[PDB]
Design a protein around this ligand. Structure first.
Ligand code: DAN
Length: 474
């Protein structure tokens, strides 16, 4: 008989707009990862001030060693301190938002890659004008600092020493090696031995320096099964092109290729916007990857690059076409070596791109599956084997709006084609972002967004189900 466990709340939001027991109003953006040790890591955005995509947001996780039955206390990966002088608290804090979790099967290192924005309104507060964020000097990439009244770009060098645009050291220094809990001291700006402010503050500043106002990508990793995490690493320069406006991850759980010429490659879903149409018509999915176990990262090409739309070719850097957009996505590798990218879009149904070269380039045929509705919200999908047959499990809202969570089952053939077999409900009422993981022995787990009884968006809950729940009619 079909089996589905009762929902268990992992990250509890407050209700009626009030903070929860820990003084936090909202939780969002679930990530679920089953590690080599069998541990379950549930990650999420800890949105203290409100549910919006900005403000004071920490990257946190909880661990379960009994396959989801019980969970340990919250573990904070990164939580930047707010600007104590910001006029509007709701938007007065440097921001981290949306994470992707994944573990290297060989080194066992667990990665959490997430967005970073200096103080502001995140993706909804990006400037119309670009500001250079890095500058190369003698084969050395340094992060730039701007000072009001001066056009020249200062730079942060060894030991966090701030250098003038002319190449001279100053008495200013940045905390590049934070040591406080959650690394809340990262970016602190000192003059001599006195703390003046923070390079991530953009308003009512007390120090002379700030980084470029742009979208960044950070990475933290754990070598102890998620118990402790390293200080944030800025990987933005390795993958963000000069034309890119926004560059962020497609939240959830990434993968490591299991077969093919690119086996071992780590894939992280991401998406960008350009300066032509930004959020109106340029959101384009793609992936970033690492072939050296997370040491260095590289950007693949966008699904939209050289894509044919209405008889004409477009590019992710210049496009202005609402319906041709593809944003957050989930990635899966098939046994035939192909990489499938299920992308959140505006067609009303499931859009999927296919890569034959480890995720670098994408084939011309972007298939749509009317069998799986898409109300324009994040989704997750995972590869799975059952009785010698290859399948794909995908979960997302069934509609009309972000509600009625569904778990779709598809059969994968040798040519990589998909055949949707079943569509079973898993959660009534509100349902949004989710993250699926195979637990083994025919069981699966899912961390998802849901609310009820007046809960703030959202409360992240966990459920487990087996094959009987997937196939047989409920
Ligand atoms: C970085 C960021 O803002 N991510 C947010 C995402 C984004 O705003 C959208 O993809 C832009 O089109 O939207 C949503 C959402 O619930 O729909 C929550 C995500 O945290």
């Amino acid at each position: 008989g079909a089996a589905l466990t009762e929902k268990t709340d992992i990250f509890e939001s407050g209700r009626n707009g009030k903070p929860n027991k820990d003084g936090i109003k909202s939780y969002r953006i679930p990530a679920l990862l089953k590690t080599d040790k069998g541990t379950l890591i549930a990650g999420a955005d800890e949105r203290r001030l409100h549910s919006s995509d900005w403000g004071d947001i920490g990257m946190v996780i909880r661990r379960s060693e009994d396959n989801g039955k019980t969970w340990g206390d919250r573990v904070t990966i990164t939580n930047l301190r707010d600007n104590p002088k910001a006029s509007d608290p709701s938007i007065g804090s440097p921001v981290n938002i949306d994470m992707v979790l994944v573990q290297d099967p060989e080194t066992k290192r667990i990665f959490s890659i997430y967005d970073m924005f200096p103080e502001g309104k995140g993706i909804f507060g990006m400037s119309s004008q670009k500001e250079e964020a890095y500058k190369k000097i003698d084969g050395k990439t340094y992060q730039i600092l701007y000072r009001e009244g001066e056009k020249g770009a200062y730079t942060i060098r060894e030991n966090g020493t701030v250098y003038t645009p002319d190449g001279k050291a100053t008495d200013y220094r940045v905390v590049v090696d934070p040591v406080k809990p959650a690394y809340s001291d990262k970016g602190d700006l000192y003059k001599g031995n006195q703390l003046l402010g923070n390079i991530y503050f953009t308003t009512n500043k007390t120090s002379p320096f700030r980084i470029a106002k742009d979208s960044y990508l950070w990475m933290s990793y754990s070598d102890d099964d998620g118990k402790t995490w390293s200080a944030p690493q800025d990987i933005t320069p390795m993958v963000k092109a000069d034309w890119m406006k926004f560059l962020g991850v497609g939240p959830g759980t990434g993968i490591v290729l299991r077969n093919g010429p690119h086996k071992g490659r780590i894939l992280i879903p991401v998406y960008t916007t350009n300066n032509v149409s930004h959020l109106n018509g340029s959101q384009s999915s793609r992936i970033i990857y690492s072939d050296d176990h997370g040491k260095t990262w590289h950007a693949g090409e966008a699904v939209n690059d050289n894509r044919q739309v209405d008889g004409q070719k477009i590019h992710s850097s210049t496009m202005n076409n609402r319906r041709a957009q593809n944003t957050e996505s989930t990635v899966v590798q098939l046994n035939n070596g192909d990489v499938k990218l299920f992308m959140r879009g505006l067609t009303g149904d499931l859009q999927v791109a296919t890569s034959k070269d480890g995720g670098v380039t994408w084939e011309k045929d972007i298939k749509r599956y009317p069998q799986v509705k898409d109300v324009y919200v994040q989704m997750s999908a995972i590869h799975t084997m059952h009785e010698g047959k290859e399948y794909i499990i995908l979960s997302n809202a069934g509609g009309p709006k972000r509600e009625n969570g569904m778990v779709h089952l598809a059969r994968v053939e040798e040519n990589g084609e998909l055949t949707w077999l079943k569509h079973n409900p898993i959660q009534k009422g509100e349902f949004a972002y989710n993250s699926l993981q195979e637990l083994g022995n025919g069981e699966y787990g899912i961390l998802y967004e849901h609310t009820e009884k007046g809960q703030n968006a959202y409360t992240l809950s966990f459920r487990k189900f087996n094959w009987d729940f997937l196939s047989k009619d409920l």
